[PDB]
Design a protein around this ligand. Structure first.
Ligand SMILES: O=C(O)[C@@]1(O)C[C@H](O)[C@@H](O)[C@H]([C@H](O)[C@H](O)CO)O1
Ligand SMILES: O=C(O)[C@@]1(O)C[C@H](O)[C@@H](O)[C@H]([C@H](O)[C@H](O)CO)O1
Ligand SMILES: O=C(O)[C@@]1(O)C[C@H](O)[C@@H](O)[C@H]([C@H](O)[C@H](O)CO)O1
Length: 383
């Protein structure tokens, strides 16, 4: 790979700073957040970078009062190089006591689409969970009030502002479903112009002129809840999904007409956690980048890899993120999201956990922003 001849570049710092950290991230209203989880990042067509997360207000749990927050690079050209290149925290949506999350953006010309999941603030995946007012949640169910919803918001001003989210559940989630997820992480725009957003059990397909899309479901058999989508160099679609059981990623391939079976990919260990994938370039040699925790049981084995295959059948060992460790952010590992920057880097958001309460709800979570070039990957000591 000719990119391995370049001097290796990496840089890393916290981008979403939990309440316990110095200079914690707060909205302009003064609302701060115990934890940030569930990253998503995209480069827009101006070069600006948009970074999204769940602002988990009171603890690190997946339910309760959770706002979908974001930052942008201050200019379209700074590429997120330094901490001071980023704007202060902003909010996409935070209405009510509800959960707003699962950011899943896709850039479409001069429009950025952002899909997101939602649940009523009185409900949680399992039910019976304690909330800050001393009540217990109800279990998410198939009722309109109790199910997971799917919302869409857009921006036509390079992420500066967002439309009021529109509930798309009745047309873009199967009837009768209870739990749901979109992404989280990102969707894609195909070479043939359609938009594809990964979701639980299905893809969501956007068709129409750029910025004036209408959406439909592509129902999958055997897909996961938290999926990734890619158009591989052969032009085919690939789903690479978080498994139910701990072990390995679950992968399927196909087209807009349908995907083939999902199968365990024994080349990609995974501890039942979200991952991220990125088509980096289409010119020779075409590359796909994959990031997850490369372990069958822990989230603290973050690894970024390259595939040169036209179907992304095989990835290399790649490079363990711990080789460029970041201090003062807790223990790195968990969900991730990647984009390509204008200056030929990969920009990745990566979860990190202070772990003060171990796996309990009081452990503060933050999100790291990494940038690195292909050379840093290629030249990994074990690659
Ligand atoms: O590190 C990069 O990104 C590089 O500079 C060198 C790579 O070998 C080449 O594949 C790549 C590609 O030409 C552009 O990314 C446009 O897709 O450019
Ligand atoms: O860190 C996790 O594991 C998490 O709990 C965080 C997410 O907020 C949640 O939506 C998702 C979900 O619980 C699983 O995908 C099983 O449905 O996973
Ligand atoms: O590697 C893991 O998975 C770990 O042990 C350490 C991680 O730093 C932490 O974020 C994670 C989390 O508390 C559990 O995965 C919840 O089930 O636990």
């Amino acid at each position: 790979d000719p990119a391995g001849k370049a001097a290796q570049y990496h840089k890393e710092y916290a981008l979403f700073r939990s309440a316990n950290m110095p200079s914690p991230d707060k909205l302009a209203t003064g609302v701060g957040f115990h934890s940030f989880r569930i990253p998503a990042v995209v480069r827009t067509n101006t070069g600006r970078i948009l970074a999204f997360a769940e602002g988990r207000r009171h603890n690190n749990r997946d339910y309760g009062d959770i706002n979908l927050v974001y930052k942008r690079t201050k200019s379209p050209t700074n590429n997120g190089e330094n901490p001071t290149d980023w704007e202060s925290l902003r909010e996409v949506v935070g209405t009510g006591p509800h959960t707003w999350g699962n950011p899943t953006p896709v850039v479409d010309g001069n429009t950025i689409y952002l899909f997101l999941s939602m649940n009523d603030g009185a409900y949680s995946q399992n039910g019976g969970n304690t909330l800050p007012d001393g009540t217990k949640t109800k279990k998410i169910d198939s009722t309109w009030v109790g199910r997971r919803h799917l919302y869409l918001t857009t921006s036509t001003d390079d992420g500066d502002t967002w439309t009021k989210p529109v509930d798309m559940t009745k047309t873009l989630t199967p009837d009768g479903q209870a739990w749901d997820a979109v992404g989280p992480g990102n969707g894609i725009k195909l070479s043939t112009g359609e938009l594809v957003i990964p979701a639980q059990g299905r893809n969501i397909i956007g068709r129409g002129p750029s910025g004036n899309r209408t959406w439909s479901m592509q129902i999958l058999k055997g897909a996961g809840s938290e999926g990734t989508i890619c158009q591989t160099p052969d032009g085919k679609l690939m789903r690479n999904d978080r498994p139910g059981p701990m072990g390995h990623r679950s992968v399927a391939r196909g087209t807009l007409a349908g995907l083939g079976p999902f199968a365990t990919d024994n080349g990609l260990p995974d501890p039942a956690c979200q991952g991220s994938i990125l088509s980096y370039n289409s010119d020779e040699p075409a590359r796909t980048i994959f990031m997850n925790s490369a372990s069958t049981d822990r989230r603290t084995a973050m690894r970024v890899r390259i595939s040169y295959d036209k179907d992304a059948a095989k990835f290399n060992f790649g490079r363990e993120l711990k080789d460029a460790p970041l201090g003062n952010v807790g223990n790195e590992g968990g969900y991730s999201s990647m984009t390509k920057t204008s200056d030929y880097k990969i920009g990745a958001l990566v979860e990190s956990d202070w772990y003060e309460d171990k796996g309990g709800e009081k452990s503060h979570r933050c999100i790291i922003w990494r940038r690195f070039n292909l050379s840093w990957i290629i030249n990994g000591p074990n690659n």
